[PDB]
Amino acid sequence: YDALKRQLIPSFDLLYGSAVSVVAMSVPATARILDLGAGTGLLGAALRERLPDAELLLQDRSQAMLEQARQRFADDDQVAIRVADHLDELPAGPFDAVVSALSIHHLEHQDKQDLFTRIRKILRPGGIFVNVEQVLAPTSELEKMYDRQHEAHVLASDTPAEEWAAGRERMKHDIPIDVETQIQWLRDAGFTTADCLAKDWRFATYAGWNG
Ligand SMILES: Nc1ncnc2[nH]cnc12
Ligand SMILES: [Ca+2]
């Protein structure tokens, strides 16, 4: 399933790589990290590669996806798993970092804002939130150009026609917003610094710091 993710997501290495790099420059080797909506655990695995000694908690509503996540980690790896929705109470922590990839765009805008507040509450002072996210263009005219650029990647990756059809169907349930609006929502939630680190049209890695 990993091959398909790279066919569907432009600049996979730049965007996931940027998320790992900003965490590695922000938190200690022994950081406590929550992967929020870990899915099959691609972001969690990339963090473990860079941070062998980090304490990782992988959270998702899907037991099936978390089972595929646990398969990526060695039997003796201390990685922990929690079955929970984004809208459920977050784990107590504290955490040095909270990370998410391609999950929070499924939430209503009001629930995104509430989630940002609840994440800041479980972060230590100076702690980091990182999102690798599907973002809306700021105008309907630019959204058409974002869509053409996404399709150009998908077609050039030789994506099976039925897998792109399935992708389009899943995207009817997306509630994306532009990157600058959700970065401002981090500031509104009390993150003292927020920045867009990397972007490829529809996809972006952004971060907020608690202090
Ligand atoms: N709302 C949600 N809660 C948990 N995991 C998710 N993955 C995608 N959407 C999710
Ligand atoms: Ca989606």
Residue numbers in the entry: 18 to 228
Sentences from the paper on this structure:
Here, we characterize the O-methyltransferases BelI and CysG, which catalyze the initial step of β-lactone formation. Employing techniques such as crystallography, computational analysis, mutagenesis, and activity assays, we identified a His-His-Asp (HHD) motif in the active sites of the two enzymes, which is crucial for binding a catalytically active calcium ion. As expected, BelI as well as CysGΔN16 adopt the class I methyltransferase Rossmann fold, characterized by a core domain of a seven-stranded β-sheet flanked by α-helices. The HHD-motif enables regiospecific C1-carboxy group methylation of their respective malic substrates.
Due to the high crystallization tendency of CysGΔN16, subsequent mutagenesis experiments were focused on this variant. This approach enabled the production of both full-length and N-terminal truncated mutants in high purity, which were characterized in activity assays and used for structural studies. Specifically, the C1-carboxyl group of each substrate interacts with Arg22 and the divalent metal ion, while the C4-carboxyl group forms hydrogen bonds with His167 and Arg187. Moreover, Arg22 was found to be important for cosubstrate binding, with the CysGfl-R22K mutant displaying a 44% reduction in activity compared to wt.
